[PDB]
């Protein structure tokens, strides 16, 4: 390796990234992007696995330090903790009515 060598004989540092998938749980993933919050609007949400549709507003309840989301007595998602602000946001179904 001399500094006067042309293209072809110069040292080229090459790295190899080998991806392996086994029966073990997936530990390395891609960076999951995050969007801004919005209040008092009918908007679909997706925090961890919850794919619903409703209006997110500030709540007055307090979850446990490990409980992510909650649900009402009717087995329907009622509130969910924000994964970044650690705040509880109520989930209310959007306006459903007949004309």
């Amino acid at each position: 390796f001399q500094p006067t060598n042309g293209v072809g004989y110069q040292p080229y540092r090459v790295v190899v990234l080998s991806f392996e998938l086994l029966h073990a749980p997936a530990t390395v993933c891609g960076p999951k992007k995050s969007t801004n919050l919005v209040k008092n609007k009918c908007v679909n949400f997706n925090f961890n696995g919850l794919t619903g549709t409703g209006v997110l507003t500030e709540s007055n309840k307090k979850f446990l330090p490990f409980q992510q989301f909650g649900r009402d007595i009717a087995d329907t998602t009622d509130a969910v903790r924000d994964p970044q602000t650690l705040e509880i946001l109520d989930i209310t179904p959007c306006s459903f009515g007949g004309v």
Partner: protein, 283 residues
């Protein structure tokens, strides 16, 4: 590096009928003032729980029982300590260098959590030294694993220094643990309840909260408890003898799939539970 332990008279293992303890949070869902029915790996309200003793008599049984216990579907590990004798556990299948194993141990400075195919020993334990010169313990002789190779997971906590002195009196500390291994995830539940007892832990209820979730695709068949030993100038022994075990005792109960009726209060904390497999008036 491993050193066996002699002068340990064998005693028939005792059993203690566990109370309603063992109930944990099966999921991370918030419920308030409702009675939810769950069908998961729970612990019955009354079952045989093996009682392991760790004491040191003044003469005419020295017990340091920490055998390799099986892991069928989940174990309920409750520790009634007074001087932090239990350091951790050793999970795995055969505890050999041919298959991977789980090592969870606290060496008084960090919470060492390594998942490698270690080469464990028959008597893995930690030791302290009651040095009268500087009035300090400064535990050493970390004898858990001999050869570590091909590690796939490692986790350490922030440096700290817990109390290592030998307290005299009753068990003023209760640590309950529930270990589960489903879908390749190793779920650990923990709960600390300050009590004051000497033996046969009192009846009560404590909902164990989820502590960590370590994703490790390994098979867990058996596990062993890592205890500690005390050594000082008044200890006859050079290599195998010359040690004493502080007053401590842990309980191990295996989980069974049953239906439990969880009672949540206005704050989302489980207050009571009903096992509808125990006796009449429960179903």
């Amino acid at each position: 590096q491993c050193v066996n332990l002699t002068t340990r008279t064998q005693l028939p293992p005792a059993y203690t009928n566990s109370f309603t303890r063992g109930v944990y949070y099966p999921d991370k869902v918030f419920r308030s003032s409702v009675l939810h029915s769950t069908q998961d790996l729970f612990l019955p309200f009354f079952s045989n729980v093996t009682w392991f003793h760790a004491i040191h008599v003044s003469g005419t049984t020295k017990r340091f029982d920490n055998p390799v216990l099986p892991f069928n579907d989940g174990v309920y590990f409750a520790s009634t300590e007074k001087s932090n004798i239990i350091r951790g556990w050793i999970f795995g299948t055969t505890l050999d260098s041919k298959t991977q194993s789980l090592l969870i141990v606290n060496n008084a400075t960090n919470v060492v959590i390594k998942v490698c195919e270690f080469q464990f020993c028959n008597d893995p334990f930690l030791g302290v030294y009651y040095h009268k010169n500087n009035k300090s313990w400064m535990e050493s002789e970390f004898r858990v694993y001999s050869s570590a190779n091909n590690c796939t997971f490692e986790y350490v906590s922030q440096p700290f220094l817990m109390d290592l002195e030998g307290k005299q009196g009753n068990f003023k500390n209760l640590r309950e643990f529930v270990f589960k291994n489903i879908d390749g995830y190793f779920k650990i539940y923990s709960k600390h309840t300050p009590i004051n007892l000497v033996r046969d832990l009192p009846q009560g209820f404590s909902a164990l909260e989820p502590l960590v979730d370590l994703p490790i695709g390994i098979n867990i068949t058996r596990f062993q408890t890592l205890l500690a030993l005390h050594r000082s100038y008044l200890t006859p022994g050079d290599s195998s003898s010359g040690w004493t075990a502080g007053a401590a005792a842990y309980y191990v109960g295996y989980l069974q799939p049953r239906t439990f009726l969880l009672k949540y209060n206005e704050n989302g904390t489980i207050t009571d539970a009903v096992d509808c497999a125990l006796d009449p008036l429960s179903e």
